[PDB]
Ligand binder design. Structure first.
Ligand SMILES: Nc1ncnc2c1ncn2[C@@H]1O[C@H](COP(=O)(O)OP(=O)(O)OP(=O)(O)OP(=O)(O)OP(=O)(O)OP(=O)(O)O)[C@@H](O)[C@H]1O
Ligand SMILES: Nc1ncnc2c1ncn2[C@@H]1O[C@H](COP(=O)(O)OP(=O)(O)OP(=O)(O)OP(=O)(O)OP(=O)(O)OP(=O)(O)O)[C@@H](O)[C@H]1O
Length: 124
């Protein structure tokens, strides 16, 4: 149905905008990317950079993953990101999100040959 690297791109890449254009960005994008299909995904981050720039994080600062694996990496530079978090007024299937646009470092887990992002761990 989907490989981990393609799922990462679907859930986390928005190379087509430099930032969230409106407070409704998350509401639109979490629907469009099919993150509201069977439940409201409670938190998600979109990265406004090229896939290459995000893949390159896999060779940057090695850091511990939240789950305790050691295959996580922190971006040297900040990156334009948009944090999407479910609101309290949100109830499936009417998923509602707060949109937060910021410059943060991203932390992703990388696997495979080629070594590519497969999980978005945090932004710092
Ligand atoms: N170091 C690592 N290396 C490889 N895979 C890793 C990993 N740490 C976690 N995972 C995988 O991800 C899920 C954990 O996620 P968590 O339990 O911590 O919360 P979650 O809501 O994200 O659940 P899922 O939307 O099902 O997970 P993903 O499909 O990978 O979406 P994701 O990339 O995380 O989006 P963001 O919300 O973070 O922005 C698990 O299935 C886990 O096996
Ligand atoms: N060890 C390394 N090995 C390989 N490539 C490396 C690297 N360090 C950086 N790069 C790459 O060179 C370009 C410039 O990066 P640079 O790191 O040289 O500029 P930068 O201005 O972006 O850094 P800093 O203000 O020093 O960062 P921090 O002080 O830690 O926090 P904060 O200021 O808030 O955020 P950011 O400013 O980073 O966005 C980037 O493309 C980056 O990927």
């Amino acid at each position: 149905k989907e490989t981990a690297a393609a799922k990462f791109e679907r859930q986390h890449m928005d190379s087509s905008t430099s930032a969230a254009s409106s407070s409704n960005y998350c509401n639109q994008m979490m629907k469009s990317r099919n993150l509201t299909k069977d439940r409201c995904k409670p938190v998600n981050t979109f990265v406004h950079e090229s896939l290459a720039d995000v893949q390159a994080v896999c060779s940057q600062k090695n850091v511990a993953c939240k789950n305790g694996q050691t295959n996580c990496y922190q971006s040297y530079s900040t990156m334009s990101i948009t944090d999407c978090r479910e609101t309290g007024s949100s109830k499936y299937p009417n998923c509602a999100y707060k949109t937060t646009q910021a410059n943060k470092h991203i932390i992703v887990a990388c696997e495979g040959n080629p070594y590519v992002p497969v999980h978005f761990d945090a932004s710092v």
